[PDB]
């Protein structure tokens, strides 16, 4: 499965100041950025254009350019019309894209959050408020649904453009998407810590062992990203001291073959 997610983050401080920035991910790898200070969408991979031609890419980019200006104008107009009921500052986030599944399968999404809370989605052929969203959103959403052109374009982008573009990405990015990077491990410390860093892809197994027996008390921490598209994880084990002798951290990962890393506490 890979999920392609286009993330837009827009901040409005007052009638005079706002910015919109986006980042696009395929799985856990960034493919684009679009900074507010930039006229055009930046590639963060050599394959970020997927299989689109320079001219399709340009048309697609020009639509987004138009959308980003329209979006900004429409939200500021919306705040004026509601004044003084919707107060600055305002934070709007959108998460849009598709999840590619086994075979030909894909599902798209478009969710919108306001002040950090999900309020609206596009589903089927229209925009909807999600239950629990503030009731002042109903009217502007009813209005936006009367805009047939936007509805068709959003339907096309979600139902058609997204999956097709992403199949081109997985083709074009294949060698980065399937890359394998090997973890290095080290031990520190009462509480024993096994630190494992530099692995890719994300799936990994890390355990405190005594001989053949997995120590059940092993606690896996969170996966933390490194800055070079690899992952960091630690696993910790609480142990009565003296008692440290005979424990080892074991790491199993696809990049290693069946050559696990085994680190024994005590050297």
């Amino acid at each position: 499965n890979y999920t392609f997610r286009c993330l837009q983050m827009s901040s409005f401080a007052n009638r005079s100041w706002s910015r919109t920035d986006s980042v696009v991910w395929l799985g856990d790898l960034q493919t684009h950025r679009w900074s507010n200070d930039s006229a055009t969408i930046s590639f963060t991979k050599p394959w970020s254009q997927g299989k689109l031609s320079n001219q399709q890419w340009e048309k697609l980019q020009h639509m987004f350019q138009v959308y980003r200006v329209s979006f900004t104008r429409d939200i500021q107009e919306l705040v004026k019309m509601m004044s003084p009921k919707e107060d600055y500052p305002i934070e709007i986030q959108l998460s849009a894209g598709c999840e590619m599944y086994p075979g030909n399968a894909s599902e798209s999404f478009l969710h919108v959050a306001f002040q950090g809370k999900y309020v609206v989605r596009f589903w089927g052929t229209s925009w909807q408020t999600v239950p629990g969203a503030p009731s002042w959103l109903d009217l502007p959403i009813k209005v936006l649904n009367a805009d047939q052109g936007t509805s068709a374009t959003v339907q096309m982008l979600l139902n058609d453009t997204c999956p097709l573009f992403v199949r081109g990405l997985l083709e074009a990015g294949k060698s980065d998407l399937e890359k394998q990077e090997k973890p290095v491990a080290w031990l520190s410390s009462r509480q024993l810590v096994c630190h494992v860093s530099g692995f890719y892809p994300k799936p990994v197994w890390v355990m405190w062992m005594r001989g053949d027996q997995e120590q059940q008390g092993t606690h896996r921490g969170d996966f933390l990203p490194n800055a070079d598209e690899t992952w960091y994880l630690q696993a910790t084990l609480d142990v009565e001291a003296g008692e440290e002798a005979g424990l080892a951290c074991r790491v199993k990962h696809s990049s290693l073959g069946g050559q696990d890393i085994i680190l024994y506490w005590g050297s």
Partner: protein, 99 residues
């Protein structure tokens, strides 16, 4: 409403004294997205810190990763200090010399 940042500091390679390495400061779970992040060496601001693009998670909270070249030694401390509207005072988390 506001969410206070969580801060974790950890090194890219095993930290060995005198060996150049990369120290990471990952700041998560915050809202709104405006934030200020410094990495400190003995309490002083480190100049060349690189930041990722800000992004957000499934639960909508924001996150960003900062990282810098560093050499662990027997006598230097390192830390990550964050300023955010959700806190009255800048919050600082020291690297624990192991992570």
């Amino acid at each position: 409403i506001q969410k206070t940042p969580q801060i974790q500091v950890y090194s890219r390679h095993p930290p060995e004294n005198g060996k150049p390495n990369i120290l990471n400061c990952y700041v998560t779970q915050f809202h709104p997205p405006h934030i200020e992040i410094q990495m400190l060496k003995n309490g002083k601001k480190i100049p060349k810190v690189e930041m990722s693009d800000m992004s957000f998670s499934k639960d909508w909270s924001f996150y960003i990763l900062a990282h810098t070249e560093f050499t662990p030694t027997e006598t230097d401390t390192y830390a990550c200090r964050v300023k955010h509207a959700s806190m009255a005072e800048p919050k600082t988390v020291y690297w624990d010399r192991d992570m």
